[PDB]
């Protein structure tokens, strides 16, 4: 009494499509701000806001998940701005976002030591001890 | 320099997007049907189906161009998309199931409605190219 | 003692102010994008949807009323965005709105069949076939 | 080459009937009215309760509110406007004037009529105020 | 185990100083005050200069705003909230009244004095309102 | 020319700010611990702590710069702040109580986490400059 609409290639077009959101940023709702506080206040008063998508963050990081679930919700259809621990440089946050969007990132020899710590504190899957 | 990766990103991501269909978290669009609310009685219009912009954009060329040509430039607001009358509320929900999980079991009676709607909205995998 | 007050010319002034309302656009809180997709839009410049007001829509369209009163997720305050079926062009929706505001629109015969269909789609009083 | 007046006879009656439903309902309200109560000869300002109203009706039915909402611009879609009405206006008088602009008819107790009529003169409401 | 007690007695001084500086830097402001008038009904200057203020001081000083924010029929989560005060307060008077709540002191010309006192009375502002 | 006085301004005001320590009324920023790096088995133990922007900018050189440097270009958004790894939920509440009310009593075991946080957050009376 039923037919079945299979589609083998769904996941593959989903993979290619999502990966662009690391680059075209369309439908972004989360803006991540760095707090490294490197070399004085006046250099980056308009701090560069990293664009991100809530669902990716919740999927890849437990810390973002428990946040978006239990956090006090104020604007359900407006942007959220989040500013990350001062231990994390802006390039580190960019690498982490890339890794959360591709699952596969390259990192300079002088940023790996920090990205691992960021992932551990952000409980990003693939970077947690847990 | 170092290359950082882990074994299985797509499995967890696919599992997450799978539930996103039913946990309805983070929705950004609302889908309504002009199709007959049981006909004359007007009793039961499609109250609305909440969805996610990035999925309908990724898997439907109609919805993608809709979201590109119809910008919600305000700081806040949810897109109330009213679809053509071809799409009964059953058809809309099944097609959204398909745009999420890449699969949909379909009852025989609505086959000619869903196979139609998929081409109407050009959902990849349903639409004939 | 109990007392009574009334205004005779209330109705005419009110309705005439309403007629001008969509022209001056004051207090508009709905935007009706028109996805007519004529011959295939290559994601060109935005269609510039029509401004409208919720109270008049819901007082005229039996469908817009339900859409506005019970949307599963809603914008709490301020402008709201609707995009209409591909059946209805920007000109038709523009005429179809003026009709709901003023009760009459000098529709052209050449698009009469699109306006007449559109009324049933939005179940607009005066046009709805029921 | 030809045109037609697509028209409805009962639009005016249906619409007026669908607007008189508003003030008795919170639907689509976009302004909230307050006042110094004048509850006991000396206003009681603590217990004030906002009265939801609609810009599109106040602006047409009274001139004071029109220039208010005109010259107090809406700088954000998410902005909600509250109006602190003059102290001479009690909540009940404001309660009725909120009806008067919608229903076009009101019945009042004589003990407030002399403050409600003055309120009409202040807010420059059609029918009540001179022009 | 020890329940050691922290303090620095100059804290409240710095808190007050920061609030006083808040008055003129206007950062983190979330509520904007307008003054109702027909004066701006002419092409020369239609849009009123909306005064910025902070929610927490208004409720801290004025119980009228305290209620206006504690309970209201509708509200916004995070967007700035706009209020227009009665026509009895000119822009100078409302600015002075904001200063008084913000810092507890002010200076007024005698031609400003009466209007400021009356407006503060209606706004239930501590130190001006009599009861 | 004339002058206004309100001698009870501060005392009334101070009481009306201590109260804000308890309730979200007028809250502007949310502080989240990140302390699980300490080895805690939990997934996430914390739920965002509510705070008011202007107060933290008053007491903290770290926050006072931060809320200035975070643009919040969207006027209808709100700010979530992830505090450093070293600061637990318990310790931050003591730090905020100190920030909001000028006094806090801290257990000897958390003493070296509240005091440590003070320099990490450059909160005056705990920071060394």
Residue numbers in the entry:
A (entry chain B), C (entry chain F): 4 to 133
B (entry chain A), F (entry chain C): 5 to 133
D (entry chain E), E (entry chain D): 3 to 133
Provide the authors' own sentences about this structure as they appear in the paper.
BTB (bric-a-brack, Tramtrack, and broad complex) is a diverse group of protein-protein interaction domains found within metazoan proteins. The Tramtrack group (TTK) is a distinct type of BTB domain, which can multimerize. TTK-type BTB domains contain a highly conserved N-terminal FxLRWN motif, where x is a hydrophilic residue. Thus, the TTK-type BTB domains are a structurally and functionally distinct group of protein domains specific to Arthropodan transcription factors.
To enhance particle contrast on cryo-EM images, we used the BTB domain of CG67651-133 fused to MBP (40 kDa), which resulted in a monomer Mw of 56 kDa. Iterative masked refinement excluding flexible MBP regions resulted in a final reconstruction of core CG67651-133 multimer at a resolution of 3.3 Å (full data processing flowchart is shown at Figure 3—figure supplement 1). The map clearly shows the hexameric assembly consisting of three dimers. CG6765 hexamer consists of three canonical BTB dimers with extensive hydrophobic molecular contacts and main-chain hydrogen bonds (N78, V82, Y84, V86) forming a β-sheet between two parallel β4-strands. In addition, a bifurcated hydrogen bond is formed from the side chain hydroxy group of Y84 of one dimer to the sidechain of T77 and main-chains of either N78 or I76 of the second dimer. Furthermore, a few inter-dimer hydrogen bonds are formed between (i) T50 and T73, (ii) N78 and N80, and (iii) side chain hydroxy group of Y36 and P75/M70 main chain atoms. Interdimeric interactions were further strengthened by hydrophobic contacts between A2 (F66, M70, P75), the loop preceding B1 (I48), and B2/B1/B3 sheet (V34, V86), with the B3 strand formed by residues highly conserved only within the TTK group. Residues with large hydrophobic or aromatic side-chains at positions corresponding to Y84 and V86 of CG6765 are characteristic for all TTK-type BTBs, whereas residues involved in stabilizing interactions at B1/A2 and adjacent loops are less conserved. The N-terminal TTK-motif is located within the first β-strand and is involved only in intra-dimer stabilization forming antiparallel beta-sheet with B4. Central part of the hexamer forms a pore, residues of loop regions surrounding the pore are not conserved, thus it is unlikely that it can possess some physiological function.
